[PDB]
A paper describes a structure:
Hepatocyte nuclear factor 1A (HNF-1A) and HNF-4A are transcription factors that engage in crossregulatory gene transcription networks to maintain glucose-stimulated insulin secretion in pancreatic β cells. Variants in the HNF1A and HNF4A genes are associated with maturity-onset diabetes of the young (MODY). HNF-1A and HNF-4A form a crossregulatory loop, in which both factors regulate the respective other’s gene transcription. HNF-1A binds to the P2-HNF4A promoter and activates P2-driven gene transcription.
Numbering used by the authors:
A (entry chain A), B (entry chain B): 94 to 180, 201 to 276
The structure:
DNA sequence: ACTGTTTACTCTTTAACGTAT
DNA sequence: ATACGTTAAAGAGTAAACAGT
């Protein structure tokens, strides 16, 4: 019950501030850690179009409903650090990871395994600093950990858009 | 059977030309009549992804798969012209319509009922010309008919995205 | 292990709805 | 007849699988 009283207290104060300011906060946290909105909808129980509109535009939503978003934020933000202190969702390419990939697509559109392995760490390190963690805590990215196969399927799908 | 043999002839002639050339034809016909891609993948059985990627990008699909679309295209093309001569889908705003609606939204954000009725004709007219039929045959648009209610829900949902 | 075919999934966009006025 | 609050539906995007060289 100790951390509990803390968590329920944060839900209180977050329920007092402007929805938009506390919404832009939670969305940035989602993007930063590349957390799917489906994970929220699945656990919380709110409609997606409501979430998306609230997180992207500012559509007001009932305080009851909002609370559940804040309870999940506080609980998940606790979980991520625990997942990272120890070194079912689809992998999502991070924006920093995609920068290095498109850059390497200009040098070689068909790189070797070792050429992809070097790309793996440069992306997993760029993700680890987007989260705000040391790159040594890499397996904490979980379902979003970059694998050479994922780098492969990224390069293979990119050759499709050519023609 | 007399038109049937004709329909099978069009399906084969199109099955010989370039996928992309005849794909761009279908989308333009879908965009011209604001026909849901869903209608295709309901009546065909195709995959929306595969479909969407074929009409929007150059992604190929097998001749058997293609053929099903061409039979839908050829039969639906005859069915609409019939609908307009003898004159459950969601309504979709046309681009010629939306041009008028956004234009008057600058003149008045809350138009009178009669002011909306004037807009109704200017749009059904624009949609009919887009589809290439005389506006006297405006009952043929079916689920794409512009009603004053639809104009209202538009203007209402538009002022929503103002804050 | 690479190409091409097809796909399960995710997110946004949107017209309408439903409930209070 | 109308604001908000909320929602069912559509379609694009995407990572991945599956077959089959």
């Amino acid at each position: 019950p100790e951390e509990a009283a803390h968590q329920k207290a944060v839900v209180e104060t977050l329920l007092q501030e402007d929805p938009w300011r506390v919404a832009k906060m939670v969305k940035s946290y989602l993007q930063q850690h590349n957390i799917p909105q489906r994970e929220v909808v699945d656990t919380t129980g709110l409609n997606q179009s409501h979430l998306s509109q609230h997180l992207n535009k500012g559509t007001p939503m009932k305080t009851q409903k909002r609370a559940a978003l804040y309870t999940w934020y506080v609980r998940k933000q606790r979980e991520v650090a625990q997942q990272f202190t120890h070194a079912r969702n689809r992998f999502k390419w991070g924006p920093a990871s995609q920068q290095i990939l498109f850059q390497a697509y200009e040098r070689q559109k068909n790189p070797s395994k070792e050429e992809r392995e070097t790309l793996v760490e440069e992306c997993n390190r760029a993700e680890c600093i987007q989260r705000g963690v040391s790159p040594s805590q890499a397996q904490g990215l979980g379902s979003n950990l970059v694998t050479e196969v994922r780098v492969y399927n990224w390069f293979a799908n990119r050759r499709k858009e050519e023609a």
